[model samples]
Target: DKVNLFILGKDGLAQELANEIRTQSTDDEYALDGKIYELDLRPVDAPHGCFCVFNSIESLSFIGEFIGKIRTEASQIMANLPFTLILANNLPILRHQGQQLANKLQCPFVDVPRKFNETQIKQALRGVLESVKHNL
Candidate 1:
């Protein structure tokens, strides 16, 4: 499960990032379990925006089994694309829960500030993509 990148966002940032990704992607054409989008900073066919960030609603509670189910599906997709994760910091009481899952699966992680909006998320994602490309 070698992951290419991971980005974490707090509060509603994950949801916002998901929506932005949803709107500007063609990868959705494929039948995926979780869902994917093209953080298309360019037309290059790069492995960007491949992730499934799911967190517990409450501060400390979680749906472990549910995450397992999604993680399975996510792993399948990740096998075919870059992998990343964005969980809320507020969920930290159990946030390491995600890290455990990620470590077991061999994915990457990135913690972001809480309450990110569309612009900030887009910028962050774009920067990550550029960095990946540049580093390569």
Candidate 2:
């Protein structure tokens, strides 16, 4: 199955970084299940006023798949975006949510620290990115 990686929260350095993750040449490199498969990076939204945050309990609909059976609600529009990995934006000065959202969704989560350095992320992250295929 193609891994669906969803990026939650609004734009930030987080947003810019996500835009940088392209699937042009590395699609065949990151082979999943012993086949050529790659991360399907997607951008998802969260409703205003209420959002999923540190151990949040306000909105369950935003976290897709939280509604088990009888989950139908036509009038209501929730984010309901399915994901294999969900990333949430955060800063050290702010409260955290990525881990919470991931726990709720039961999928992998990457919290992009807002105030971090670029070269650090670039030199290290590129290794992680390319090495993911190797790890798999």
Query: 13-124 in candidate 1: lDDT tens per residue?
Result: 4446555545645644311234343332221110454443455644112323444555688777633333444453345645576677556545554444425344444444
> Which has the greatest lDDT?
1
Q: Write candidate 2's Cα lDDT for 1-136 as tens digits.
A: 3544444433342244455555332634344334464555554453111112121222223344433321466344423433323233315322244445456644344333334334433332333344343345
TM-score of every candidate relative to the true structure = 0.41, 0.35
Where does model 2 exceed 4 Å of error? Answer: 1-4, 12-15, 27-35, 45-98, 113-136
Q: Pick the candidate with the highest TM-score.
A: 1
Worst 10 residues of 1 by lDDT: 37-46
Q: How far off is residue 52 in model 2, in Å? A: 10
lDDT of 1: 0.44
lDDT of each: 0.44, 0.37
